[PDB]
Amino acid sequence: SAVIGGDNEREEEDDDIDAVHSFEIANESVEVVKKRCQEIDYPVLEEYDFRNDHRNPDLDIDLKPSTQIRPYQEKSLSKMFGNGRARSGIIVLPCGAGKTLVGITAACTIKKSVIVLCTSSVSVMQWRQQFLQWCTLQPENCAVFTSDNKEMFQTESGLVVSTYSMVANTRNRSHDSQKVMDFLTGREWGFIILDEVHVVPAAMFRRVVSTIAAHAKLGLTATLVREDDKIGDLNFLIGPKLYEA
DNA sequence: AAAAAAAAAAGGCGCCTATAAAAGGGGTTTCAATGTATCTATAACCAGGCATAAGTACTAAAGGGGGTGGGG
């Protein structure tokens, strides 16, 4: 019959298509970590029919802010555009560079429910303000999902902003990872933005990505490489540096 | 009994009241509205005392990752 997919606890069950992913011996079903949901894009451009039981995106309005981009910023964005993950991957730029502008552009371009993963709450507030262009921070179009408050909303530069996570009963999206597709989490959001992606390689934080169906992934950072060389894992989950300056 | 001083009283003198009508000047004495220093009720002033709200630093906690040294 028609192809179908569904999300189960940070994994994607698959039916009617052997080609798309990998088969599970234990239970005859194609199963994959949530991160490899993107192969579904194969059906998209193709306009191949499938049923998407897996993704539960928060409803997202088609954003149309106007974001001006200097030339280098456009170049990086375009590199990112090629795969929006393999090509998006991570963008490395100096602090002055205006990576956030690129992020904003991707969010506008993508216009899907988005999750931003940041280290601190302050950065979260900062991002939240920028998100205002799509709809002001006061606007519903922006939300914050953390221990303090849990709001699950759509698109923006990232409609949802959350932190990497901490250790506690309640924490950031890492804790939440099964619950809602983010850079961190399960099946709510299509785009995952990692501000300061270098943090992501933490053994725990990395799960945020794996557990995520979110096809598009962007990591922003001044310095990609880690002393630990943990940075290597990013390519699979997030992507490798498609652009650097 | 007498002389003496002190007292009340008389008679006389002068001026007052009410009557009258009608030509120019200067006097003192009392009373009018419009103002200083001091008073009143008001309005407004400081400094000092107590209660509520905002910001502080403080201690307070738990959660973890990474690197170096020692032992097998």
PDB file of C-alpha atoms (C1' of nucleotides) in Angstrom:
ATOM      1  CA  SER A   1       0.000   0.000   0.000  1.00  0.00           C
ATOM      2  CA  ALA A   2       0.978   3.588   0.558  1.00  0.00           C
ATOM      3  CA  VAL A   3       4.033   4.436   2.588  1.00  0.00           C
ATOM      4  CA  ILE A   4       3.449   5.345   6.201  1.00  0.00           C
ATOM      5  CA  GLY A   5       5.551   6.421   9.139  1.00  0.00           C
ATOM      6  CA  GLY A   6       4.988   7.000  12.834  1.00  0.00           C
ATOM      7  CA  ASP A   7       7.058   8.192  15.750  1.00  0.00           C
ATOM      8  CA  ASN A   8       7.653   5.992  18.723  1.00  0.00           C
ATOM      9  CA  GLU A   9       9.777   7.205  21.627  1.00  0.00           C
ATOM     10  CA  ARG A  10      12.571   8.955  19.777  1.00  0.00           C
ATOM     11  CA  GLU A  11      12.386   6.448  16.876  1.00  0.00           C
ATOM     12  CA  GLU A  12      10.517   6.312  13.583  1.00  0.00           C
ATOM     13  CA  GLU A  13       8.557   3.227  12.690  1.00  0.00           C
ATOM     14  CA  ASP A  14       8.205   2.767   8.941  1.00  0.00           C
ATOM     15  CA  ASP A  15       5.785   0.913   6.734  1.00  0.00           C
ATOM     16  CA  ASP A  16       5.565   0.122   3.034  1.00  0.00           C
ATOM     17  CA  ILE A  17       9.012   1.248   2.106  1.00  0.00           C
ATOM     18  CA  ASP A  18      12.158  -0.841   2.355  1.00  0.00           C
ATOM     19  CA  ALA A  19      14.170   1.683   0.401  1.00  0.00           C
ATOM     20  CA  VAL A  20      13.781   4.625   2.704  1.00  0.00           C
ATOM     21  CA  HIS A  21      15.578   3.330   5.753  1.00  0.00           C
ATOM     22  CA  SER A  22      16.545   0.181   7.666  1.00  0.00           C
ATOM     23  CA  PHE A  23      14.678  -3.012   8.573  1.00  0.00           C
ATOM     24  CA  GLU A  24      14.303  -4.329  12.104  1.00  0.00           C
ATOM     25  CA  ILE A  25      14.973  -8.008  12.533  1.00  0.00           C
ATOM     26  CA  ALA A  26      13.391  -8.279  15.939  1.00  0.00           C
ATOM     27  CA  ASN A  27      10.106  -6.889  14.782  1.00  0.00           C
ATOM     28  CA  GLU A  28       9.558  -6.933  11.063  1.00  0.00           C
ATOM     29  CA  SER A  29       9.286  -3.227  10.640  1.00  0.00           C
ATOM     30  CA  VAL A  30      11.537  -0.534   9.411  1.00  0.00           C
ATOM     31  CA  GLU A  31      12.788   1.358  12.405  1.00  0.00           C
ATOM     32  CA  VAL A  32      15.178   4.208  12.744  1.00  0.00           C
ATOM     33  CA  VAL A  33      16.266   6.707  15.280  1.00  0.00           C
ATOM     34  CA  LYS A  34      14.119   9.787  15.003  1.00  0.00           C
ATOM     35  CA  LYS A  35      16.945  11.758  13.451  1.00  0.00           C
ATOM     36  CA  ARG A  36      16.820   9.805  10.219  1.00  0.00           C
ATOM     37  CA  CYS A  37      13.253  10.923   9.493  1.00  0.00           C
ATOM     38  CA  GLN A  38      14.666  13.269   6.866  1.00  0.00           C
ATOM     39  CA  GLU A  39      15.028  10.527   4.314  1.00  0.00           C
ATOM     40  CA  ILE A  40      11.271  11.208   3.948  1.00  0.00           C
ATOM     41  CA  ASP A  41      12.380  14.228   1.951  1.00  0.00           C
ATOM     42  CA  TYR A  42      12.907  11.637  -0.693  1.00  0.00           C
ATOM     43  CA  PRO A  43       9.190  11.448  -1.000  1.00  0.00           C
ATOM     44  CA  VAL A  44       8.738  15.240  -0.746  1.00  0.00           C
ATOM     45  CA  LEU A  45      10.501  16.654  -3.764  1.00  0.00           C
ATOM     46  CA  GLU A  46       9.229  13.649  -5.608  1.00  0.00           C
ATOM     47  CA  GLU A  47       5.792  14.342  -4.267  1.00  0.00           C
ATOM     48  CA  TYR A  48       5.644  10.624  -3.447  1.00  0.00           C
ATOM     49  CA  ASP A  49       2.678   9.633  -1.325  1.00  0.00           C
ATOM     50  CA  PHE A  50       3.190   8.669   2.283  1.00  0.00           C
ATOM     51  CA  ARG A  51       1.248   9.020   5.489  1.00  0.00           C
ATOM     52  CA  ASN A  52       3.002  10.963   8.150  1.00  0.00           C
ATOM     53  CA  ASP A  53       1.881   9.565  11.472  1.00  0.00           C
ATOM     54  CA  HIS A  54       5.243  10.361  13.029  1.00  0.00           C
ATOM     55  CA  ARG A  55       5.480  14.091  12.907  1.00  0.00           C
ATOM     56  CA  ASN A  56       3.175  16.113  15.040  1.00  0.00           C
ATOM     57  CA  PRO A  57       4.195  19.584  14.164  1.00  0.00           C
ATOM     58  CA  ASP A  58       2.776  22.460  16.009  1.00  0.00           C
ATOM     59  CA  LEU A  59       0.757  24.418  13.520  1.00  0.00           C
ATOM     60  CA  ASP A  60       2.968  26.986  11.897  1.00  0.00           C
ATOM     61  CA  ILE A  61       2.010  30.060   9.919  1.00  0.00           C
ATOM     62  CA  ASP A  62       3.945  30.860   6.788  1.00  0.00           C
ATOM     63  CA  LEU A  63       6.308  33.517   7.998  1.00  0.00           C
ATOM     64  CA  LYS A  64       7.160  36.437   5.841  1.00  0.00           C
ATOM     65  CA  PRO A  65       9.383  38.863   7.650  1.00  0.00           C
ATOM     66  CA  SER A  66      11.981  40.631   5.593  1.00  0.00           C
ATOM     67  CA  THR A  67      15.515  39.777   6.614  1.00  0.00           C
ATOM     68  CA  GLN A  68      18.352  41.637   4.980  1.00  0.00           C
ATOM     69  CA  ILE A  69      21.450  39.592   4.554  1.00  0.00           C
ATOM     70  CA  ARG A  70      24.934  40.732   3.725  1.00  0.00           C
ATOM     71  CA  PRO A  71      26.696  38.701   1.120  1.00  0.00           C
ATOM     72  CA  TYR A  72      28.731  36.384   3.310  1.00  0.00           C
ATOM     73  CA  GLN A  73      25.641  35.654   5.326  1.00  0.00           C
ATOM     74  CA  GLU A  74      23.822  34.761   2.166  1.00  0.00           C
ATOM     75  CA  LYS A  75      26.635  32.484   1.115  1.00  0.00           C
ATOM     76  CA  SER A  76      26.594  30.577   4.364  1.00  0.00           C
ATOM     77  CA  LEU A  77      22.852  30.374   4.299  1.00  0.00           C
ATOM     78  CA  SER A  78      22.930  29.027   0.784  1.00  0.00           C
ATOM     79  CA  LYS A  79      25.463  26.414   1.700  1.00  0.00           C
ATOM     80  CA  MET A  80      23.141  25.486   4.501  1.00  0.00           C
ATOM     81  CA  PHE A  81      20.223  25.404   2.092  1.00  0.00           C
ATOM     82  CA  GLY A  82      21.624  22.506   0.123  1.00  0.00           C
ATOM     83  CA  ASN A  83      20.615  19.952   2.689  1.00  0.00           C
ATOM     84  CA  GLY A  84      19.370  22.085   5.500  1.00  0.00           C
ATOM     85  CA  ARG A  85      21.323  19.661   7.602  1.00  0.00           C
ATOM     86  CA  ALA A  86      23.981  17.940   5.669  1.00  0.00           C
ATOM     87  CA  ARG A  87      24.499  21.248   3.960  1.00  0.00           C
ATOM     88  CA  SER A  88      22.963  23.237   6.773  1.00  0.00           C
ATOM     89  CA  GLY A  89      24.917  21.415   9.335  1.00  0.00           C
ATOM     90  CA  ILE A  90      26.797  23.945  11.287  1.00  0.00           C
ATOM     91  CA  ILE A  91      27.941  27.398  10.385  1.00  0.00           C
ATOM     92  CA  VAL A  92      31.065  28.757  11.955  1.00  0.00           C
ATOM     93  CA  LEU A  93      31.499  32.493  12.216  1.00  0.00           C
ATOM     94  CA  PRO A  94      33.058  35.040  14.486  1.00  0.00           C
ATOM     95  CA  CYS A  95      30.807  36.696  17.054  1.00  0.00           C
ATOM     96  CA  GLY A  96      30.327  39.890  15.037  1.00  0.00           C
ATOM     97  CA  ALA A  97      29.342  37.847  12.003  1.00  0.00           C
ATOM     98  CA  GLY A  98      25.608  37.853  12.524  1.00  0.00           C
ATOM     99  CA  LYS A  99      24.933  34.137  12.557  1.00  0.00           C
ATOM    100  CA  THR A 100      21.595  34.950  14.122  1.00  0.00           C
ATOM    101  CA  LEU A 101      20.627  36.712  10.897  1.00  0.00           C
ATOM    102  CA  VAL A 102      21.314  33.525   9.006  1.00  0.00           C
ATOM    103  CA  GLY A 103      19.291  31.634  11.579  1.00  0.00           C
ATOM    104  CA  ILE A 104      16.458  34.090  11.187  1.00  0.00           C
ATOM    105  CA  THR A 105      16.601  33.634   7.473  1.00  0.00           C
ATOM    106  CA  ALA A 106      16.479  29.887   7.724  1.00  0.00           C
ATOM    107  CA  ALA A 107      13.542  30.118  10.049  1.00  0.00           C
ATOM    108  CA  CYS A 108      11.762  32.401   7.684  1.00  0.00           C
ATOM    109  CA  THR A 109      12.725  30.289   4.726  1.00  0.00           C
ATOM    110  CA  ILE A 110      11.761  27.051   6.396  1.00  0.00           C
ATOM    111  CA  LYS A 111       8.681  28.475   8.139  1.00  0.00           C
ATOM    112  CA  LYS A 112       8.202  25.357  10.164  1.00  0.00           C
ATOM    113  CA  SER A 113       7.799  24.958  13.863  1.00  0.00           C
ATOM    114  CA  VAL A 114      11.191  25.566  15.208  1.00  0.00           C
ATOM    115  CA  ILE A 115      13.158  24.889  18.314  1.00  0.00           C
ATOM    116  CA  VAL A 116      16.184  26.783  19.427  1.00  0.00           C
ATOM    117  CA  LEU A 117      18.512  25.142  21.884  1.00  0.00           C
ATOM    118  CA  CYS A 118      20.570  27.583  23.905  1.00  0.00           C
ATOM    119  CA  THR A 119      22.935  27.223  26.833  1.00  0.00           C
ATOM    120  CA  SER A 120      21.410  29.880  29.042  1.00  0.00           C
ATOM    121  CA  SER A 121      18.082  31.498  29.807  1.00  0.00           C
ATOM    122  CA  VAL A 122      19.484  34.913  29.026  1.00  0.00           C
ATOM    123  CA  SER A 123      20.422  33.855  25.536  1.00  0.00           C
ATOM    124  CA  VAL A 124      16.936  32.440  25.333  1.00  0.00           C
ATOM    125  CA  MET A 125      15.437  35.789  26.156  1.00  0.00           C
ATOM    126  CA  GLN A 126      17.706  37.406  23.619  1.00  0.00           C
ATOM    127  CA  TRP A 127      16.720  34.977  20.933  1.00  0.00           C
ATOM    128  CA  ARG A 128      13.113  35.380  21.920  1.00  0.00           C
ATOM    129  CA  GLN A 129      13.296  39.105  21.287  1.00  0.00           C
ATOM    130  CA  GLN A 130      14.749  38.635  17.809  1.00  0.00           C
ATOM    131  CA  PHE A 131      12.010  36.141  17.018  1.00  0.00           C
ATOM    132  CA  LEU A 132       9.738  39.147  17.344  1.00  0.00           C
ATOM    133  CA  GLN A 133      10.127  39.914  13.662  1.00  0.00           C
ATOM    134  CA  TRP A 134       8.023  36.910  12.739  1.00  0.00           C
ATOM    135  CA  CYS A 135       5.677  37.922  15.508  1.00  0.00           C
ATOM    136  CA  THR A 136       6.853  39.892  18.487  1.00  0.00           C
ATOM    137  CA  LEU A 137       7.973  38.105  21.615  1.00  0.00           C
ATOM    138  CA  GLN A 138       4.701  39.206  23.071  1.00  0.00           C
ATOM    139  CA  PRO A 139       3.223  37.450  20.155  1.00  0.00           C
ATOM    140  CA  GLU A 140       2.213  33.838  20.463  1.00  0.00           C
ATOM    141  CA  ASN A 141       4.477  33.134  17.564  1.00  0.00           C
ATOM    142  CA  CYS A 142       7.254  33.013  20.114  1.00  0.00           C
ATOM    143  CA  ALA A 143       7.366  30.649  23.077  1.00  0.00           C
ATOM    144  CA  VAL A 144       9.780  29.317  25.666  1.00  0.00           C
ATOM    145  CA  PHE A 145       9.930  25.704  26.784  1.00  0.00           C
ATOM    146  CA  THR A 146      11.966  25.203  29.910  1.00  0.00           C
ATOM    147  CA  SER A 147      11.578  24.393  33.587  1.00  0.00           C
ATOM    148  CA  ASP A 148      10.316  27.877  34.269  1.00  0.00           C
ATOM    149  CA  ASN A 149       7.480  27.666  31.812  1.00  0.00           C
ATOM    150  CA  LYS A 150       6.516  25.239  29.140  1.00  0.00           C
ATOM    151  CA  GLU A 151       5.014  26.733  26.046  1.00  0.00           C
ATOM    152  CA  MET A 152       4.816  24.718  22.913  1.00  0.00           C
ATOM    153  CA  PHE A 153       4.419  26.833  19.894  1.00  0.00           C
ATOM    154  CA  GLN A 154       5.395  26.904  16.195  1.00  0.00           C
ATOM    155  CA  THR A 155       7.650  28.785  13.821  1.00  0.00           C
ATOM    156  CA  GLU A 156       9.579  31.970  14.347  1.00  0.00           C
ATOM    157  CA  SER A 157      13.279  32.284  13.934  1.00  0.00           C
ATOM    158  CA  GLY A 158      12.535  29.503  16.314  1.00  0.00           C
ATOM    159  CA  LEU A 159       9.172  29.707  17.818  1.00  0.00           C
ATOM    160  CA  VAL A 160      10.245  27.644  20.735  1.00  0.00           C
ATOM    161  CA  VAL A 161      13.330  28.514  22.659  1.00  0.00           C
ATOM    162  CA  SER A 162      14.745  26.129  25.206  1.00  0.00           C
ATOM    163  CA  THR A 163      18.008  25.332  26.897  1.00  0.00           C
ATOM    164  CA  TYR A 164      20.206  22.266  26.428  1.00  0.00           C
ATOM    165  CA  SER A 165      19.041  20.820  29.764  1.00  0.00           C
ATOM    166  CA  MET A 166      20.261  20.300  33.270  1.00  0.00           C
ATOM    167  CA  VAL A 167      20.020  17.610  35.863  1.00  0.00           C
ATOM    168  CA  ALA A 168      16.711  17.637  37.648  1.00  0.00           C
ATOM    169  CA  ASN A 169      13.229  16.269  37.489  1.00  0.00           C
ATOM    170  CA  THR A 170      12.448  19.110  35.168  1.00  0.00           C
ATOM    171  CA  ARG A 171      15.008  20.606  32.878  1.00  0.00           C
ATOM    172  CA  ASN A 172      15.532  21.734  29.367  1.00  0.00           C
ATOM    173  CA  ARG A 173      14.764  19.958  26.165  1.00  0.00           C
ATOM    174  CA  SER A 174      17.279  17.230  26.767  1.00  0.00           C
ATOM    175  CA  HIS A 175      15.052  16.006  29.572  1.00  0.00           C
ATOM    176  CA  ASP A 176      12.063  16.567  27.325  1.00  0.00           C
ATOM    177  CA  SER A 177      13.645  14.735  24.345  1.00  0.00           C
ATOM    178  CA  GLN A 178      10.985  12.065  23.883  1.00  0.00           C
ATOM    179  CA  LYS A 179       8.152  14.596  24.266  1.00  0.00           C
ATOM    180  CA  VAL A 180       8.569  17.290  21.628  1.00  0.00           C
ATOM    181  CA  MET A 181      10.621  17.472  18.445  1.00  0.00           C
ATOM    182  CA  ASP A 182      13.265  20.053  18.919  1.00  0.00           C
ATOM    183  CA  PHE A 183      16.924  20.147  18.351  1.00  0.00           C
ATOM    184  CA  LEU A 184      16.392  18.501  21.560  1.00  0.00           C
ATOM    185  CA  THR A 185      13.280  16.747  21.357  1.00  0.00           C
ATOM    186  CA  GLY A 186      10.820  14.321  19.713  1.00  0.00           C
ATOM    187  CA  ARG A 187       8.110  15.059  17.128  1.00  0.00           C
ATOM    188  CA  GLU A 188       6.820  18.628  17.616  1.00  0.00           C
ATOM    189  CA  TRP A 189       9.316  20.587  15.548  1.00  0.00           C
ATOM    190  CA  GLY A 190      10.770  20.416  12.029  1.00  0.00           C
ATOM    191  CA  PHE A 191      13.757  22.690  12.538  1.00  0.00           C
ATOM    192  CA  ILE A 192      16.331  22.512  15.244  1.00  0.00           C
ATOM    193  CA  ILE A 193      18.650  25.408  15.848  1.00  0.00           C
ATOM    194  CA  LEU A 194      21.597  24.938  18.117  1.00  0.00           C
ATOM    195  CA  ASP A 195      23.037  28.160  19.324  1.00  0.00           C
ATOM    196  CA  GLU A 196      26.588  27.340  20.306  1.00  0.00           C
ATOM    197  CA  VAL A 197      26.341  23.829  18.860  1.00  0.00           C
ATOM    198  CA  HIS A 198      29.631  22.919  20.479  1.00  0.00           C
ATOM    199  CA  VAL A 199      27.723  22.058  23.674  1.00  0.00           C
ATOM    200  CA  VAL A 200      25.575  19.501  21.835  1.00  0.00           C
ATOM    201  CA  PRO A 201      28.187  16.756  21.768  1.00  0.00           C
ATOM    202  CA  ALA A 202      27.704  16.160  25.469  1.00  0.00           C
ATOM    203  CA  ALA A 203      26.674  12.582  25.819  1.00  0.00           C
ATOM    204  CA  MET A 204      23.272  13.571  27.101  1.00  0.00           C
ATOM    205  CA  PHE A 205      22.627  16.657  25.008  1.00  0.00           C
ATOM    206  CA  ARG A 206      23.398  14.744  21.857  1.00  0.00           C
ATOM    207  CA  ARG A 207      20.296  12.602  22.485  1.00  0.00           C
ATOM    208  CA  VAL A 208      18.232  15.658  21.930  1.00  0.00           C
ATOM    209  CA  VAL A 209      19.132  15.500  18.214  1.00  0.00           C
ATOM    210  CA  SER A 210      18.936  11.746  17.768  1.00  0.00           C
ATOM    211  CA  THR A 211      15.505  11.577  19.332  1.00  0.00           C
ATOM    212  CA  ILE A 212      14.381  14.408  17.044  1.00  0.00           C
ATOM    213  CA  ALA A 213      12.558  13.912  13.787  1.00  0.00           C
ATOM    214  CA  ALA A 214      13.375  17.547  12.907  1.00  0.00           C
ATOM    215  CA  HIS A 215      14.785  17.239   9.450  1.00  0.00           C
ATOM    216  CA  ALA A 216      16.429  20.558   9.357  1.00  0.00           C
ATOM    217  CA  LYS A 217      19.261  21.205  11.692  1.00  0.00           C
ATOM    218  CA  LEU A 218      21.526  24.160  12.097  1.00  0.00           C
ATOM    219  CA  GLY A 219      24.363  24.557  14.529  1.00  0.00           C
ATOM    220  CA  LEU A 220      25.883  27.953  15.112  1.00  0.00           C
ATOM    221  CA  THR A 221      29.315  28.433  16.568  1.00  0.00           C
ATOM    222  CA  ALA A 222      32.543  30.418  16.644  1.00  0.00           C
ATOM    223  CA  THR A 223      34.612  27.300  17.231  1.00  0.00           C
ATOM    224  CA  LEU A 224      33.482  23.940  15.889  1.00  0.00           C
ATOM    225  CA  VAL A 225      36.280  21.698  17.074  1.00  0.00           C
ATOM    226  CA  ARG A 226      36.400  20.376  20.579  1.00  0.00           C
ATOM    227  CA  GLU A 227      39.451  19.235  22.473  1.00  0.00           C
ATOM    228  CA  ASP A 228      37.624  15.972  23.068  1.00  0.00           C
ATOM    229  CA  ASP A 229      37.108  15.510  19.336  1.00  0.00           C
ATOM    230  CA  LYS A 230      33.515  14.797  20.292  1.00  0.00           C
ATOM    231  CA  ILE A 231      32.748  17.268  17.530  1.00  0.00           C
ATOM    232  CA  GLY A 232      32.905  14.320  15.149  1.00  0.00           C
ATOM    233  CA  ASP A 233      29.462  13.053  16.235  1.00  0.00           C
ATOM    234  CA  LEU A 234      27.808  16.240  15.035  1.00  0.00           C
ATOM    235  CA  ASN A 235      28.149  15.353  11.384  1.00  0.00           C
ATOM    236  CA  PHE A 236      25.745  12.487  11.677  1.00  0.00           C
ATOM    237  CA  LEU A 237      23.172  14.056  13.948  1.00  0.00           C
ATOM    238  CA  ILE A 238      23.501  17.752  13.156  1.00  0.00           C
ATOM    239  CA  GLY A 239      25.894  17.867  10.224  1.00  0.00           C
ATOM    240  CA  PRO A 240      29.437  18.891   9.516  1.00  0.00           C
ATOM    241  CA  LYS A 241      30.627  22.421   9.023  1.00  0.00           C
ATOM    242  CA  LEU A 242      29.292  23.367   5.660  1.00  0.00           C
ATOM    243  CA  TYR A 243      30.590  26.873   6.010  1.00  0.00           C
ATOM    244  CA  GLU A 244      33.382  28.510   7.958  1.00  0.00           C
ATOM    245  CA  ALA A 245      35.181  31.807   8.069  1.00  0.00           C
TER     246      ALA A 245
ATOM    247  C1'  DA B   1     -23.520 135.344 135.193  1.00  0.00           C
ATOM    248  C1'  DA B   2     -20.914 136.918 132.013  1.00  0.00           C
ATOM    249  C1'  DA B   3     -18.250 137.591 127.542  1.00  0.00           C
ATOM    250  C1'  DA B   4     -17.077 135.378 123.640  1.00  0.00           C
ATOM    251  C1'  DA B   5     -17.056 132.658 119.068  1.00  0.00           C
ATOM    252  C1'  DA B   6     -19.605 129.971 115.794  1.00  0.00           C
ATOM    253  C1'  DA B   7     -23.630 129.077 113.504  1.00  0.00           C
ATOM    254  C1'  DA B   8     -28.170 129.594 110.759  1.00  0.00           C
ATOM    255  C1'  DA B   9     -30.956 132.778 108.827  1.00  0.00           C
ATOM    256  C1'  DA B  10     -32.708 136.916 106.547  1.00  0.00           C
ATOM    257  C1'  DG B  11     -32.800 140.630 102.967  1.00  0.00           C
ATOM    258  C1'  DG B  12     -31.008 142.313  98.844  1.00  0.00           C
ATOM    259  C1'  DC B  13     -28.874 142.027  94.198  1.00  0.00           C
ATOM    260  C1'  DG B  14     -28.202 140.108  89.668  1.00  0.00           C
ATOM    261  C1'  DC B  15     -29.562 136.993  85.644  1.00  0.00           C
ATOM    262  C1'  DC B  16     -32.401 132.991  83.665  1.00  0.00           C
ATOM    263  C1'  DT B  17     -36.488 130.940  81.323  1.00  0.00           C
ATOM    264  C1'  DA B  18     -40.270 131.941  77.104  1.00  0.00           C
ATOM    265  C1'  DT B  19     -41.685 136.184  73.080  1.00  0.00           C
ATOM    266  C1'  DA B  20     -40.709 138.560  69.187  1.00  0.00           C
ATOM    267  C1'  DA B  21     -38.003 139.384  63.626  1.00  0.00           C
ATOM    268  C1'  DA B  22     -33.665 139.883  60.840  1.00  0.00           C
ATOM    269  C1'  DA B  23     -28.124 141.524  57.884  1.00  0.00           C
ATOM    270  C1'  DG B  24     -22.015 138.836  57.548  1.00  0.00           C
ATOM    271  C1'  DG B  25     -17.495 135.926  59.543  1.00  0.00           C
ATOM    272  C1'  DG B  26     -14.441 133.127  62.589  1.00  0.00           C
ATOM    273  C1'  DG B  27     -14.066 129.860  66.699  1.00  0.00           C
ATOM    274  C1'  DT B  28     -13.573 125.155  68.574  1.00  0.00           C
ATOM    275  C1'  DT B  29     -15.158 120.150  68.646  1.00  0.00           C
ATOM    276  C1'  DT B  30     -16.653 115.799  66.635  1.00  0.00           C
ATOM    277  C1'  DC B  31     -16.597 112.536  62.861  1.00  0.00           C
ATOM    278  C1'  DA B  32     -15.568 110.758  57.686  1.00  0.00           C
ATOM    279  C1'  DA B  33     -12.740 107.311  54.898  1.00  0.00           C
ATOM    280  C1'  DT B  34      -8.006 105.484  54.167  1.00  0.00           C
ATOM    281  C1'  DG B  35      -3.551 103.532  56.150  1.00  0.00           C
ATOM    282  C1'  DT B  36       1.569 101.303  59.805  1.00  0.00           C
ATOM    283  C1'  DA B  37       2.743  97.542  63.322  1.00  0.00           C
ATOM    284  C1'  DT B  38       0.401  93.407  65.274  1.00  0.00           C
ATOM    285  C1'  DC B  39      -3.446  90.023  65.479  1.00  0.00           C
ATOM    286  C1'  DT B  40      -6.294  86.143  63.597  1.00  0.00           C
ATOM    287  C1'  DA B  41      -7.121  81.967  60.767  1.00  0.00           C
ATOM    288  C1'  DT B  42      -4.785  79.365  56.327  1.00  0.00           C
ATOM    289  C1'  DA B  43      -1.458  77.584  53.553  1.00  0.00           C
ATOM    290  C1'  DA B  44       3.078  75.675  53.293  1.00  0.00           C
ATOM    291  C1'  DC B  45       7.752  74.521  55.388  1.00  0.00           C
ATOM    292  C1'  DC B  46      11.307  71.817  57.339  1.00  0.00           C
ATOM    293  C1'  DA B  47      13.176  67.247  60.103  1.00  0.00           C
ATOM    294  C1'  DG B  48      12.135  63.049  62.547  1.00  0.00           C
ATOM    295  C1'  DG B  49       9.616  58.462  63.253  1.00  0.00           C
ATOM    296  C1'  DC B  50       7.194  54.079  61.625  1.00  0.00           C
ATOM    297  C1'  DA B  51       5.475  50.648  57.815  1.00  0.00           C
ATOM    298  C1'  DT B  52       5.677  48.547  52.918  1.00  0.00           C
ATOM    299  C1'  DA B  53       8.029  47.514  48.569  1.00  0.00           C
ATOM    300  C1'  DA B  54      12.346  46.804  45.616  1.00  0.00           C
ATOM    301  C1'  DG B  55      17.186  45.228  45.183  1.00  0.00           C
ATOM    302  C1'  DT B  56      21.228  43.099  47.509  1.00  0.00           C
ATOM    303  C1'  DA B  57      24.347  39.881  48.533  1.00  0.00           C
ATOM    304  C1'  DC B  58      24.577  35.689  50.940  1.00  0.00           C
ATOM    305  C1'  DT B  59      24.424  31.238  51.635  1.00  0.00           C
ATOM    306  C1'  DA B  60      22.318  27.208  49.481  1.00  0.00           C
ATOM    307  C1'  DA B  61      21.606  23.457  46.670  1.00  0.00           C
ATOM    308  C1'  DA B  62      22.458  19.571  43.098  1.00  0.00           C
ATOM    309  C1'  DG B  63      24.370  17.937  38.713  1.00  0.00           C
ATOM    310  C1'  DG B  64      28.330  16.445  35.965  1.00  0.00           C
ATOM    311  C1'  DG B  65      32.822  16.113  32.791  1.00  0.00           C
ATOM    312  C1'  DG B  66      37.904  15.917  32.301  1.00  0.00           C
ATOM    313  C1'  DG B  67      42.598  15.220  33.483  1.00  0.00           C
ATOM    314  C1'  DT B  68      46.306  13.290  36.272  1.00  0.00           C
ATOM    315  C1'  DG B  69      48.309   9.780  39.256  1.00  0.00           C
ATOM    316  C1'  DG B  70      48.598   5.212  41.126  1.00  0.00           C
ATOM    317  C1'  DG B  71      48.088   0.200  40.837  1.00  0.00           C
ATOM    318  C1'  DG B  72      47.798  -4.181  38.411  1.00  0.00           C
TER     319       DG B  72
END
